[PDB]
Amino acid sequence: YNIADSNIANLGTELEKKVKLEASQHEDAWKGAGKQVGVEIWRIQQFKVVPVPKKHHGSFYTGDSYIVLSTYHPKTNPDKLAYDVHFWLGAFTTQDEAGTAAYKTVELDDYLGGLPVQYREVQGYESERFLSLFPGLRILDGGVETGFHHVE
């Protein structure tokens, strides 16, 4: 099996990038994101990307999944912005929440031109980078209900 004349011949193209960039324009959560240095946080709630109020940033429900965008000035230019995007997966989050957080992390990456570096942060396995965002990580019991309907 070769790539030519196959369903993967258009992967990795400018066309793929254009299509996914356009799709990311249809998510209200990203409007105005990544415009200044700091940390922005959303939680997945029944497949939706819901902003977390600033006053609660750093507290995470163990039952839920989150997207954390860290905007910073890179070493290369003090007046430009660079990005780490962390998705945090609670020990008790459900499969719909973790999968939506993963897909929407890629989408936010697309929205910001591919510039964000992605980090998968499972509860209890958080990277030093993630820990460093809260110089104050607090884990809460509970979380919002799954968006899945359970097939009996």
Binding site: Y1, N2, I3, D5, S6, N7, I8, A9, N10, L11, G12, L15, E16, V19, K20, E22, A23, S24, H26, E27, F47, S65, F87, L89, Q95, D96, A98, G99, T100, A101, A102, Y103, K104, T105, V106, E107, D109, Q118, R120, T146, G147, F148, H149, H150, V151
Partner: protein, 362 residues
Amino acid sequence: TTALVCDNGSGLVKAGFAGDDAPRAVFPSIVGRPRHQDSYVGDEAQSKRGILTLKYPIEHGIITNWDDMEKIWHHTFYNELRVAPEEHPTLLTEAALNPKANREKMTQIMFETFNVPAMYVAIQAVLSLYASGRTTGIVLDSGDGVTHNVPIYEGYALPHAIMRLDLAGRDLTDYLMKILTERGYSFVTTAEREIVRDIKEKLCYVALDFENEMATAASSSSLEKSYELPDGQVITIGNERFRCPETLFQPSFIGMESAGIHETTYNSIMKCDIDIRKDLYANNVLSGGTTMYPGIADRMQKEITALAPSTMKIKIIAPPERKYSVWIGGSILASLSTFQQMWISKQEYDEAGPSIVHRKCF
């Protein structure tokens, strides 16, 4: 408006509704016709298996009988899910490296025959990776027709490193049929093959050390299992339990010269840029029914450890519901309005024809 998600496997249809945690319809991808030389689909063909010869419209993940595939899809919509397809956007799936005409004809039939309002064709292994809650990893997807390796980084498959083998569950069933008949148990008809597939699913496993397990099986009966046939006769199977899926690691068992699944996985990682191999080695995600053998994750961990640098963290992820991971990933993505935004509409198909599938579905 609820989207339909249909994962058309070579062996099993998995179909249902976006937003559900599992497919509501799972049934053999078969059309049956009288064994004495007009047709039945799926479970009703399986029900009349005594008088029917069973044909699979998909071989090695590619639709080879379009008339019968239309019967499968019609059955899925009207007889199993009991929906009107013109009322439902529909997500279909494909193995990577299929010829482009396969999804072109999928698109044509969905719009022109079933009049769906919108549709998308997704890469199966990408769906499985999202179902596992990851954007980076290497999926080993192994079903009834195709085994393939798809490395993915930050949500994008690496097409130059994708590997594919025509060795999968159907070949393992056939090999079990062959080696059981060599024990004295005749299984030959497409009907008896069904019994053998059930034996394979119930009793086979991957040995951690194949040579040692062969010696154990020849010394005592400690590895033997009984199996009751439909007529009530009880047969005993022994080293066939683990010789059958050993073929995945030693394709020469069925006369193939190709690499085993540990080697194709390693080779795929090795086709990726050096610095991301680390993340792939730590995120080998198993998907599909043929990855369900007890012992397969431990065996992959052992074999990949032997091939990889000694300092490399290796991890095999084996989700318990991985018979349905592809479908579940489809259910999640089809629940997202931004993913739906990329689907082909009927109006777009009317303007552009089948070629539009390559411009919209990635």
